[PDB]
């Protein structure tokens, strides 16, 4: 039905192993990755990556989120960077195969006691320029997140707040920070100066584990491919660090000086893409899913119940994809928390939700712009078929494949409750 | 509430080891779920009265066994008529009507090598009288099952064949027998004379384990409550044997002389019902589900994929039931093989499938009698509502409960592919 | 296959086909069940002790000799019936039958004597008849007391007090027979030497359909605590009048052993029944089959995980010795013990290897029958001048008795457990020895 | 306080996810650093005074890279290492043995090259402990190295360096005939795609752990420290992850051979390794290693598993083992006990070589002998206890597991004892 060649690719012999030791022993350098790269790449925009032509190459290389570092540069400089990112992204709207949403993240300068005056003005600039995400620098407690949230004025409540943990207090007050944040960034640069350098891996692994448990996005950042600022190829420790951040459970990986000021920005993005695909296939899904299942509390929320049912169904048939209809991105995020091997194709009419779901591992957003059908069930079926035809065009799906389809019983967000098993025709 | 997590051995269910599970079993933790292991009662002089059969149905009898080792065809035709009269006396209330299967247990080959001439005549009688199941005595090899199947003819294709394993050869050729049978009976009476008595528990536990792995019904039979032929209460070894057969994984438990000729036929049924409910709550679902999940092969069949997704969803929300629409019983059987704690409420129009699904643990058949609605989606919804109304009347469901609803995309058998999370209103 | 490949070449494929070894090496409990084989014959000596109630059908010296040969390890005297004179004669007849085999020390089988009390009746605590019966037990040197209707910790303190200063060595097994005993189980087990699941009264005091829950819970808690647990009443009931038991009865005996019972019991089946010797033989045959079907892989992992961390060297040595025995499929673990405690701590980890306990205490040799898999050897030789030589002679006595009983063969590996100094409480050494 | 240190809350966790969630930057390491550090000797680390600081910083094995330098250059490096090591021999209870490893130039465009035959002969003549054989592609390459060592170099350990696709594909046959493996990531990262090296590293470490044979992770672990005083975030992560993967040894090349901060690079690997060792999830690791090790009738194998099980049961501070060749200590090390394996030996070479096995702390016994063999055994066990107390491994009240044999000579380990300190 599938063949022996299918079960040799994407580390499938290591995936079927009964123990983690046997899983390690079965990892094969000849077993090629087949799935689309699921860990998003965040690239910092700067002099080396600001031009429209350079940004087109970075989008082609795999950049999903553009980071604007407000520690340097004026509002005029950042507005031009945003315009250049949007021009490069929209240059592909002519091809359904190549077009892809790209999120814009504003990384704040940081705090002084409460929110700094500059952070109030920069956060206001972010709302006025329609940024998708804020990477809030030096978050130490829950009230720091509340201050950032308050500064997103009356118009920016939909912006995602990713709290950067950069010091001892942020690590010790992690639970209260995660509770009020949309996600976390393990900001290793400052963390490695604030706490002993030999302890950063403990903070990284703990925070990734807690974010995976909570079902909230976690970003691993700083010096991942540092030597690539001046060299065309990274060190053995750098490729290892990127692979290990993905294996740890990071939803996103980041590039700072490598893309902002370095001599090889496109090559750094290509390297993170290549390593992430290899590491995602080496994830031990058998124990990971069992542990996420056991640790996740019992739930009476139908979206959560449908998500675990759909992920279980996808593993049973080695589904190529889980197609989900989502307005806010929440139904796709709840599928992503169970770490399915199947790609989560999220069909949405919200351009902002399509950009923001790049924060969740394995979510592939498809922005739907057709006019709504008069009969709701027909409009649902057209979106499901749009996800199928996009998957066929992009290589995720072929005729005869099985896909899992996740929908709700009525229009509007919060009603996901249906899982279907569909044969691709 | 806290009261919910104290009942049905839920503290023992959440235990991390089987030792801790045993240590947490509580005699004060009352069973809440409906009794899932079916009871087979042998019909005889003590249970032929139509009025006594009505009491046995109320006590919990699901399958009526006709032992063709004794009595003429005229005697068995009267037993069938009496069973049907008692069963159909409750048809006036469709929301509470309980289907009861009729099983024909053959005399056997005796000294011969294959199908006896009396068995050919008895099997023909079974087809002519519309029996649901055949318990084929002394099955020693796959060709014995083929001979029974051939003697049933073209009109008996829908009859389930349960092979009785009663000797050393049947145990040694178990795998080839199970492959061609619908299920197995561990016929301990003859097995305990054919092999050393001290080895029967090994054959019983092995056969139940292999049937559970194959997802095929297994019956534990003979002397389970033997002393109740003459005494009002059973021995400590008898209650232990019934509880251990359920814990082993038996889909059905049986009564022979206890209901056929004894003085306490209704009390013997009530005793098996009471013990089975206690033992089902003491099942260690945590390890059992994990092992059944791991041992079940990967599948591209949408019914199989939907079934595991629905069982996983039911465990996530502590669903009171999985309501499934089924024509042949197959969709309910595939749910049952994963041993959900949630009751599998199977709604069917087939009177025969409603009787036959009693062979699968935890399947509660509801016979739907209404003619099809003009709109197929409304006909589906009406059957789901019938499952809910029957469930509320019978005590399976209450307002506020969560239920998993399993349906298909088109009419006819073989198209189950949808799982839905529904709140009971 | 790789985890058992070199051992399969050395010991042979026939070795790994016996005693349910394919089911023992299974990775899941489901696969373990699927691999159980009626053609896989038991090889190990029967480890679950049999308690037989003495009465008119089993009182004669000649009948008792046949019951000892059939497998009786503990003789129960039911003080609910019979006078002190009747029970003293039963004790004398048991001792005469047991000592008729003392002429061959390498094969002599110790047999314990247990006194089962009448109980409190309608009273709240220790009855006056129980005080007199317990005093009789001490005067007649009984090894164990099965205390009827224990409902709380103070009931076992009262039994202990009635035994007096001369009965400090007697083991107290509390009988749980009602709802209160089940609910106060933890406090009762804490002060008792062990427990008896007394299913007769328990099945009348609580709903009959709940007894299996109480049995499985109490056996699990006793296994966790490392204290003996007895399953009792109606196990082979039909054998009181019939030569063969029912299918439910053989299943009940097998399931009590699989549950984790250290001992199984016969009441009317041996006391007044027509087939006392056959009932003992039946429990022996079923127990050997069920012991081989135990899923040691998960059982040992769970007993290790659940057992608390310990700084007691006897406890630490015991787990190391059981781990070593599993690693090499050891035929036996030979242990030197004064009180039986070192053998009990090995037994709590449920090794497949027989625990051959060499002791000079005749009472400890009888009492260790309460612990599953402990085979007591009574050493009669006087102490050597050099203590290290005396230790070695006792280990050699265990090996020679083991060879002359079928437990050991040349080429087998045995684990030897000893201590660093004389006296009880100093076990701290584990040795791997090849049998020559 | 005991259960708050060395990541003990994360150690008691029921799942790997919960283990990760419980890792605490405030939980300080207490155990001695288990993973050995291999430092490459060169112009930056050749002086006797510099070597004394590197030994104090944690260097356990000195690597001589025969790709550069003459035989005269390497003989002087060996003499300087031995002078620095023996400068601490005046205090036998704290003396740290240091192994000398010869890393070959390799076959180049050719089997065994003529330069490798001469270099291996030099190694035997100068008493090297280990050979890191470059570019091992098959079992016959190991046999050729073994033959070039001759009858005098029978005791030298051969660690095969896997540096290309063929070495990875023929890994099982190479490991079978080798004493251990080195994941030589420099050449491996050029021979196979750079993004696949982590797969080869994790697979080889897993297979070596399964076989109970030493595995070394090597190259660019702290690369930036060649010119900078502090490493990058990816470098500290790489060192920690090599230890978590299961590497027995970690290595420094240019960082110690030619860099500006050789002592600081050793101190950094020591600091990270201690943190990572405490974060190892022993609950699942021991269970998997125990399940996967085959059933055995060898008494040393049977005693080792019993001793490791006993150590976990009582939270033993150490397992003291008497060993002639190092084999009894290696069999204890394969189960990854949290308890330090204190190996007391009379063989100076075995004391140096056991640094290849994680958690083996070699003590070179140089005390006068005893007339009664049993008394000589007791004296070696007391020397292990006294050295353990002096070094901080043991305190009064601690429990230790003692592993010995029934007769003199190698191959007779069969006894395990539980001893209370003082
Ligand atoms: O390791 S065990 O052997 N059996 C553990 C065990 C039992 C039951 C389950 S199950 O999840 O419900 C399950 C049932 C049927 C399946 O098809 C199936 O896939 C799963 C799973 C595991 C054990 C461990 C202990 O710690 C102990 O005190 C007692 C026992 C014990 C020993 C022998 C027995 O036969 C027995 O009844 C109990
Ligand atoms: O028992 S272990 O500890 N491994 C633990 C282990 C690692 C990974 C998984 S995961 O399913 O991918 C998983 C990932 C993230 C989760 O959130 C998650 O829920 C699950 C699962 C388990 C061990 C066992 C071995 O046999 C061995 O050779 C090596 C190791 C090893 C290796 C790495 C370590 O960090 C370490 O401490 C030890
Ligand atoms: O993930 P979200 O934001 O809850 O959106 C899921 C929603 O999408 C749907 O599938 C389709 O809804 P719309 O037709 O309003 O887009 C709903 O049935 C469901 O509630
Ligand atoms: O379990 P079976 O026999 O495959 O029946 C399941 C079938 O029942 C249905 O849910 C309802 O079908 P009908 O309307 O024909 O009764 C189908 O969609 C599905 O294929
Ligand atoms: O099991 P117990 O009662 O603790 O007895 C174990 C004792 O037996 C011995 O092995 C031998 O002691 P004895 O010489 O007193 O018989 C002691 O070293 C050890 O302390
Ligand atoms: O680990 P190895 O090389 O087998 O050495 C272990 C040996 O050391 C001893 O403990 C002591 O032996 P020596 O007295 O010869 O040093 C032996 O009993 C044992 O066989
Ligand atoms: O701000 C950051 O990204 C950091 O400190 O790593
Ligand atoms: O035929 C039967 O039912 C038996 O033998 O048990
Ligand atoms: O007293 C007893 O032994 C009983 O009730 O089982
Ligand atoms: O030879 C080496 O050490 C390498 O290539 O890493
Ligand atoms: K910033
Ligand atoms: K029949
Ligand atoms: K009594
Ligand atoms: K070299
Ligand atoms: Mg920062
Ligand atoms: Mg029969
Ligand atoms: Mg009683
Ligand atoms: Mg190289």
User: For chains B and C, what is the number of CB pairs under 8 angstroms?
Assistant: 194
How many angstroms away from the CA of D398 is the closest CA of chain C?
Answer: 9
User: Which chains share 3+ C-beta pairs under 8 angstroms with B?
Assistant: A, C
Closest partner CB to C212 (pick from B199, B212, B243): B243
- Alpha-carbon distances, residue B263 vs A48, A276, B14, B239, B258 (angstroms): 94, 73, 42, 18, 8
Name which residue sits closest to atom 17 of ligand 4, judged by CA.
Answer: B408
Question: D413-420 and C427-434 as β-strands: parallel, antiparallel, unpaired?
Answer: antiparallel
Nearest to C84 by CA among C50, C118, C58, C52: C118
Chain centroid, CA A404 distance in Å: 21
Closest partner CB to B308 (pick from A313, A409, A422): A313
* Distance between start and end Cα atoms, chain D: 22
Nearest to C266 by CA among C292, C227, C239: C239
Element (H, E) at A275: helix A265-281
Cα nearest neighbour of B24 on chain C: C217
With a 6 A CB cut-off, is D218 part of the ligand 10 pocket? yes
Query: D190: Cβ–Cβ under 8 A, 6 or more apart, which residues?
Result: none
- B382 in a labelled binding site: no
Do A418 and B419 lie within an 8 Å CB cutoff? yes
Strand partners, C419: C427
C-alpha to C-alpha distance for B144 and B184, rounded to whole angstroms: 13
User: Which chains share 3+ C-beta pairs under 8 angstroms with D?
Assistant: A, C
C-alpha to C-alpha distance for A50 and A86, rounded to whole angstroms: 11
3 state DSSP class of B96:
coil
For testing contact with chain C, the best of B26, B170, B172, B239 (most C CBs within 10 A): B239
With a 6 A CB cut-off, is A225 part of the ligand 7 pocket? no
How many angstroms away from the CA of D205 is the closest CA of chain A?
Answer: 8
Q: Report how far ligand 3's centroid is from the alpha carbon of A329 (Å).
A: 9
Do B306 and A423 lie within an 8 Å CB cutoff? no
3 state DSSP class of D402:
strand
Domains and CATH numbers, chain D: 33-276 (3.20.20.60), 282-420 (3.40.1380.20)
Stated length of chain B: 425
Q: Report how far ligand 12's centroid is from the alpha carbon of B271 (Å).
A: 24
The DSSP result for B200-232, as a single string, is HHHHHHHHHHHHHHHT--EEEESSTTGGGGT-S
Nearest to D417 by CA among A208, C316, B385: C316
Nearest to D180 by CA among D129, D248, D121, D252: D248
Cα nearest neighbour of C327 on chain D: D295
Do A29 and D231 lie within an 8 Å CB cutoff? no
Element (H, E) at D159: strand D157-162
With 0-12 / 13-18 / 19 or more C-beta atoms within 10 angstroms meaning exposed / middle / buried, residue C360 is middle
Closest partner CB to A299 (pick from B300, B308, B316): B316
C-alpha to C-alpha distance for D38 and B49, rounded to whole angstroms: 89
> Given ligand 9 and candidates C173, C177, C270, C271, which is best to mutate, with the most ligand atoms within 8 Å of its CB?
C177
Do B224 and C216 lie within an 8 Å CB cutoff? no
Residue C50 corresponds to which tokens in the numbers above?
């049999």
| Contact predicate B166/B187, CB 8 Å | yes
Q: Which atom of ligand 6 is found nearest the CA of D330?
A: 1
Is the Cα dihedral B10, C260, A290, B324 positive or negative?
A: negative
Closest partner CB to A226 (pick from D19, D234, D242): D234
* Three-state SS letters, A142-168: HHHHHHHHHHCCCCCCCCEEEEEECCH
- C398 in a labelled binding site: no
Cα nearest neighbour of D316 on chain C: C311
Element (H, E) at A406: strand A402-408
C-alpha to C-alpha distance for C116 and A77, rounded to whole angstroms: 94
Query: B312: Cβ–Cβ under 8 A, 6 or more apart, which residues?
Result: A293, A308, A309, A312
Do D25 and A202 lie within an 8 Å CB cutoff? yes
Q: Which atom of ligand 5 is found nearest the CA of C420?
A: 18
Q: Report how far ligand 8's centroid is from the alpha carbon of B170 (Å).
A: 13
Q: Report how far ligand 7's centroid is from the alpha carbon of A188 (Å).
A: 6
C-alpha to C-alpha distance for A224 and D234, rounded to whole angstroms: 5
Q: Report how far ligand 2's centroid is from the alpha carbon of A20 (Å).
A: 6
| Contact predicate A219/A186, CB 8 Å | yes
Exp. method: X-ray
Residue A120 corresponds to which tokens in the numbers above?
């109030």
| Contact predicate B150/B114, CB 8 Å | no
With a 6 A CB cut-off, is A116 part of the ligand 3 pocket? no
Nearest to D57 by CA among D5, D101, D96: D96
Element (H, E) at A321: strand A321-325
- Alpha-carbon distances, residue A72 vs A41, A114, A191, B243 (angstroms): 22, 21, 20, 73
How many angstroms away from the CA of C26 is the closest CA of chain B?
Answer: 12
Closest partner CB to D415 (pick from C328, C329, C429): C429
Q: Which atom of ligand 1 is found nearest the CA of C297?
A: 1
How many angstroms away from the CA of A17 is the closest CA of chain D?
Answer: 13
Write the Ramachandran bin of B412: left for phi over 0, alpha for psi from -120 to 50, otherwise beta. Answer: left
3 state DSSP class of A137:
coil
Q: Which long-range contacts (CB under 8 A, 24 or more apart) does A147-152 make?
A: A147/A114, A147/A115, A148/A108, A148/A115, A148/A119, A148/A123, A149/A180, A151/A115, A151/A119, A151/A120, A151/A123, A151/A124, A152/A123, A152/A126, A152/A127
* Three-state SS letters, chain C: CCCCHHHHHHHCCCCCCCCCHHHHCCCCHHHHHHCCCCCCCCCCCCCCEEEEECCCCCCCHHHHHHHHHHCEEEEEEECCCCCHHHHHHHHHHHHHHHHCCCCCCCCCCCCEEEEECCCCCCCCCCCHHHHHHHHHHHHCCCCEEEECCCCCHHHHHHHHHHHCHHHCCCEEEEEECCHHHHHCHHHHHHHCCEEEEEHHHHHHHCCHHHHHHHHHHHHHHHHHHCCCEEEECCCCHHHHCCCCCCHHHHHHHHHHHHHCCCEEEECHHHHCCCCHHHHHHHHHHHHHHHHHCCCHHHHHHHHHHHCCCCCCHHHHHHHHHHHHHHHHCCCEEEEECCCCHHHHHHHCCCCCCEEEEEECCHHHHHHHHHCCCEEEEECCCCCCCCHHHHHHHHHHHHHHHHHCCCCCCCCCEEEEEEECCCCCCCEEEEEEEECC
Do A202 and D23 lie within an 8 Å CB cutoff? yes
Do B421 and A302 lie within an 8 Å CB cutoff? yes
| Contact predicate B391/B397, CB 8 Å | yes
Residue D290 corresponds to which tokens in the numbers above?
């125990």
Name which residue sits closest to atom 35 of ligand 1, judged by CA.
Answer: C258
Is the Cα dihedral D392, D397, D401, D402 positive or negative?
A: positive
Nearest to D30 by CA among D418, D398, D422: D398
Resolution (A): 1.9
| Contact predicate C432/D300, CB 8 Å | no
| Contact predicate D332/D319, CB 8 Å | yes
Q: Which ligand is nearest to the Cα of residue C234, counting in written order?
A: 9
Query: D183: Cβ–Cβ under 8 A, 6 or more apart, which residues?
Result: D162, D200, D201, D204, D205, D215, D216, D217, D218, D247
| Contact predicate A69/A44, CB 8 Å | yes
C-alpha to C-alpha distance for B385 and B393, rounded to whole angstroms: 12
| Contact predicate D340/D317, CB 8 Å | yes
C-alpha to C-alpha distance for D145 and D158, rounded to whole angstroms: 8
C-chain residues near D305 (CB < 8 A): 323-324, 327
Residues surrounding ion ligand 14 at CB below 5 Å: D 65, 67, 103, 134
Name which residue sits closest to atom 8 of ligand 3, judged by CA.
Answer: A326
Query: C15: Cβ–Cβ under 8 A, 6 or more apart, which residues?
Result: C8, C21, C329
Nearest to C350 by CA among C397, C307, C314: C307
Look up residue B326 and give its DSSP letter.
-
With a 6 A CB cut-off, is D413 part of the ligand 6 pocket? yes
Element (H, E) at A355: helix A351-356
Count each helix (H run) and each strand (E run) in chain B, helices first. Answer: 18, 13
Look up residue A298 and give its DSSP letter.
P
3 state DSSP class of B163:
strand
- Alpha-carbon distances, residue D316 vs C313, C327, D7, D338, D394 (angstroms): 11, 21, 16, 8, 10
Cα nearest neighbour of A320 on chain B: B300
Q: Report how far ligand 2's centroid is from the alpha carbon of D112 (Å).
A: 39
Closest partner CB to C213 (pick from B199, B238, B282): B282
Chain breaks in chain C (C to N over 2.5 A) after: none
Do B302 and A419 lie within an 8 Å CB cutoff? no
How many angstroms away from the CA of B368 is the closest CA of chain C?
Answer: 34
- Name the residue with tokens 């004894």: B262
- Alpha-carbon distances, residue A393 vs A96, A97, A98, A390, A412 (angstroms): 8, 6, 10, 5, 28
C-alpha to C-alpha distance for C184 and C255, rounded to whole angstroms: 25
| Contact predicate A48/A58, CB 8 Å | no
How many angstroms away from the CA of C229 is the closest CA of chain B?
Answer: 14
Name which residue sits closest to atom 6 of ligand 5, judged by CA.
Answer: C337
C-alpha to C-alpha distance for A231 and A239, rounded to whole angstroms: 14
User: For chains A and B, what is the number of CB pairs under 8 angstroms?
Assistant: 84
C-alpha to C-alpha distance for B313 and B309, rounded to whole angstroms: 6
């Amino acid at each position: 039905e599938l063949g022996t060649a299918f079960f040799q690719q994407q580390q499938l012999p290591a995936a079927m192993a009964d123990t983690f030791l046997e899983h390690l022993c079965l990892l094969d350098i000849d077993s090629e990755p087949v799935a689309a790269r699921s860990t998003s790449i965040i690239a910092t925009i700067g002099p080396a990556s600001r031009s429209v032509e350079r940004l087109k190459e970075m989008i082609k290389a795999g950049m999903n989120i553009a980071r604007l570092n407000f520690s340097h540069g004026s509002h005029e400089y950042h507005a031009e960077s945003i315009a250049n990112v949007r021009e490069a992204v929209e240059s592909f709207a002519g091809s359904p195969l190549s077009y892809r949403p790209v999120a814009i993240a504003l990384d704040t300068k940081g705090p002084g006691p409460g929110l700094s005056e500059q952070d109030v003005r920069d956060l206001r600039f972010g709302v006025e320029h329609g940024v998708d995400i804020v990477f809030a620098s030096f978050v130490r407690k829950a009230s720091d997140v509340a201050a950032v949230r308050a500064a997103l004025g009356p118009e920016g409540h939909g912006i995602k707040i990713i709290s950067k943990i950069e010091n001892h207090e942020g690590v010790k007050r992690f639970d209260e920070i995660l509770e009020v944040s949309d996600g976390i960034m393990v900001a290793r640069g400052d963390l490695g100066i604030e706490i002993p350098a030999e302890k950063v891996f403990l903070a990284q692994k703990m925070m990734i584990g807690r974010c995976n448990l909570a079902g909230k996005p976690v970003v691993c950042a700083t010096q991942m491919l540092e030597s690539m600022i001046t060299k065309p190829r990274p060190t053995r420790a750098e490729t290892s660090d990127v692979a290990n951040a993905v294996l740890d459970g990071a939803d996103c990986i980041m590039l700072s000086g490598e893309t902002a000021k370095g001599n090889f920005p496109v090559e750094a993005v290509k390297m993170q893409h290549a390593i992430a695909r290899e590491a995602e296939a080496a994830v031990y899904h058998r124990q990971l899913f069992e542990e996420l299942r056991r640790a996740a509390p019992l739930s009476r929320d139908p979206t959560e119940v449908t998500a675990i049912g759909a992920v279980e169904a996808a593993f049973k048939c080695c589904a190529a994809a889980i197609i989900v209809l989502t307005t806010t991105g929440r139904s796709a995020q709840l599928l992503s928390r169970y770490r399915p091997r199947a790609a989560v194709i999220a069909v949405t009419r919200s351009a902002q939700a399509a950009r923001q779901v790049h924060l969740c591992r394995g979510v592939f957003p498809l922005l739907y712009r057709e006019p709504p059908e008069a009969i709701w069930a027909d409009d649902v079926d057209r979106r499901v078929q749009f996800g199928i035809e996009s998957g066929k065009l992009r290589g995720f799906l072929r005729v005869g494949d099985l896909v899992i389809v996740v929908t709700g019983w009525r229009p509007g967000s919060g009603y996901t409750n249906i899982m279907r098993v569909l044969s691709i025709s």
